[PDB]
């Protein structure tokens, strides 16, 4: 494992932080890059068993006001538990068909995903969401988020991809996957 290589350790723990935290933006990386980060993100879970939950927050430091809307829209997603239904259409919407330009178009993605309009409007104006939006930004600050994608464990560690199983990707994934495990059981 040797810290400094695959996982760094923060000069200062974050207390009260999720067992596993991922940070992402609907604005970067682009295309296949976003879709493979997604795969990796997914496998870390088919291997992080027994009570260890994964959390994923959006970061607004990319996108401006459409970015602050997306961070709010992601809070609605987590509230409604529709993360796996709106991720790709949101991703493809903002980036691929470049159709999402306003907070309204975001709404169109949820509705076109099966979520009722009033359910969505009720969450977007709901409190739970306002508290998730603040909860997301805090986390970004607490770890002094620099950029994405990023993953932290127990609030102690910052996973570290680029000093690890280079070539391939499957080989990459099992290590990024194996690393997160330890830190949990650590
Ligand atoms: C779960 C997403 C983890 C993100 C780290 C993936 C980005 C590093 C992979 C790109 C370098 C091979």
Swiss-Prot record:
Top-level taxon of the source organism: Bacteria
NCBIfam families listed in its UniProt record: PRK10954.1
Keywords attached to this entry: Disulfide bond, Periplasm, Redox-active center, Signal
Purpose: Required for disulfide bond formation in some periplasmic proteins such as PhoA or OmpA. Acts by transferring its disulfide bond to other proteins and is reduced in the process. DsbA is reoxidized by DsbB. It is required for pilus biogenesis.
Domain Thioredoxin as annotated: residue spans: 1-129
Any one GO molecular function term: disulfide oxidoreductase activity
Family that this chain belongs to: Belongs to the thioredoxin family. DsbA subfamily.
Disulfide bonds: 28-31
Coiled-coil ranges per UniProt: none
Protein name: Thiol:disulfide interchange protein DsbA
Gene3D superfamilies xrefs: Glutaredoxin
Keyword Signal (UniProt): yes
InterPro entries recorded: DSBA-like_thioredoxin_dom (IPR001853), DsbA/DsbL (IPR023205), Thiol_disulfide_DsbA (IPR050824), Thioredoxin-like_sf (IPR036249), Thioredoxin_CS (IPR017937), Thioredoxin_domain (IPR013766)
Taxonomic source organism: Escherichia coli O157:H7
Localization per Swiss-Prot or TrEMBL: Periplasm
Name of the gene: dsbA
GO CC annotations on file: periplasmic space
